[PDB]
Design a protein around this ligand. Sequence first.
Ligand SMILES: Nc1nc2c(ncn2[C@@H]2O[C@H](COP(=O)(O)OP(=O)(O)NP(=O)(O)O)[C@@H](O)[C@H]2O)c(=O)[nH]1
Ligand SMILES: Nc1nc2c(ncn2[C@@H]2O[C@H](COP(=O)(O)OP(=O)(O)NP(=O)(O)O)[C@@H](O)[C@H]2O)c(=O)[nH]1
Ligand SMILES: [Mg+2]
Ligand SMILES: [Mg+2]
Lengths: 177, 177
Amino acid sequence: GSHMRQLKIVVLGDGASGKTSLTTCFAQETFGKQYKQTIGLDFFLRRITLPGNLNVTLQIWDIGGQTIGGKMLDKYIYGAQGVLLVYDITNYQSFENLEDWYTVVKKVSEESETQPLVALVGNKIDLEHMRTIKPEKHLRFCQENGFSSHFVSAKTGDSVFLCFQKVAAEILGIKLN
Amino acid sequence: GSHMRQLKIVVLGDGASGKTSLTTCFAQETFGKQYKQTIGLDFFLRRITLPGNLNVTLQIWDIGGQTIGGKMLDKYIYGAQGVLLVYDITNYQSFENLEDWYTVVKKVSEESETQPLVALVGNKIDLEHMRTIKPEKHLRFCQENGFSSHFVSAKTGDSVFLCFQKVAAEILGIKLN
Ligand SMILES: Nc1nc2c(ncn2[C@@H]2O[C@H](COP(=O)(O)OP(=O)(O)NP(=O)(O)O)[C@@H](O)[C@H]2O)c(=O)[nH]1
Ligand SMILES: Nc1nc2c(ncn2[C@@H]2O[C@H](COP(=O)(O)OP(=O)(O)NP(=O)(O)O)[C@@H](O)[C@H]2O)c(=O)[nH]1
Ligand SMILES: [Mg+2]
Ligand SMILES: [Mg+2]
């Protein structure tokens, strides 16, 4: 038997952001320095146990950065329980581009009459010394839109599990304490 | 609150088979005569209530027939709880081609060490008078591979809901009586 408690989590953002690295760090605990661009999308599963022995499977949709240029993106976002808006904290364009991704998220939420939880994820915090996006601006963007806030490093693993765990817990409405 | 009981159901088969029509008949009860080819894939959700007030959401992945020619297909099949192998009962090639689709299903099942339930779906039973695939052969293919057996018409709606309901119930292991 199984609850088949499965949450669709879509990971969005520019090609510099580190979406695949974040997902692979979480889903299989591994990292690669050489960039291999995701064409279209890829899919991962990882089951975690939340407090109270609450088992949940995250169905992670790792979307390719080029998809923002087409119409397939709207279909990929449809039915999401959670959305991660990922940017590279050292790359201003990756942050600026989140407006485009989030516009699509809102459009799909409006027409599907849904409301997936949205998380802003500043990746590459191992590169904090060459950070270009101010933490204050990250916070402001969260406040303006009701996003949850995360800072992570796919490379070191810093806060990656905690990010996905928090997103799952927020979707279900469970306290992490 | 919600169980978030969500099952990934992948719909596979040749471009003649009527996958999108089957999915749209189930998910929104509508039908179109003019063929509009699915590029890549599309995704649908429909929640149903099984006996005992058991609520479950089918996440239906409507795969484009052209995807068999590439490598993206393996990714789409990954993590499926159920697979529909759909053919047009009037179109021999659509039936013959199921060997190609099922080869990929088995390959993914082997490497993911999983075992999604597989259903053989003969669509277009409204065209039974021009049927080319014998029911005996459909049955034989099911027996050889342990498939569940369905005959449906996306056009008339004949047995479409029952097909998806049975697939969901078999995945969960619930008696329909
Ligand atoms: N220093 C550092 N580099 C990272 C981190 N995460 C990813 N990278 C690097 O950033 C590059 C892009 O990573 P990748 O995960 O492929 O990004 P993506 O967002 O999936 N791109 P695409 O949308 O094109 O598939 C790679 O060179 C990768 O090693 C991180 O936390 N720190
Ligand atoms: N008579 C009849 N025609 C059907 C039935 N289901 C689909 N068709 C017809 O078969 C054609 C293909 O249907 P469609 O659902 O687009 O097929 P598909 O399997 O999704 N194709 P693709 O993989 O290219 O997207 C259309 O002309 C459609 O009207 C059915 O049950 N009966
Ligand atoms: Mg990628
Ligand atoms: Mg189609």
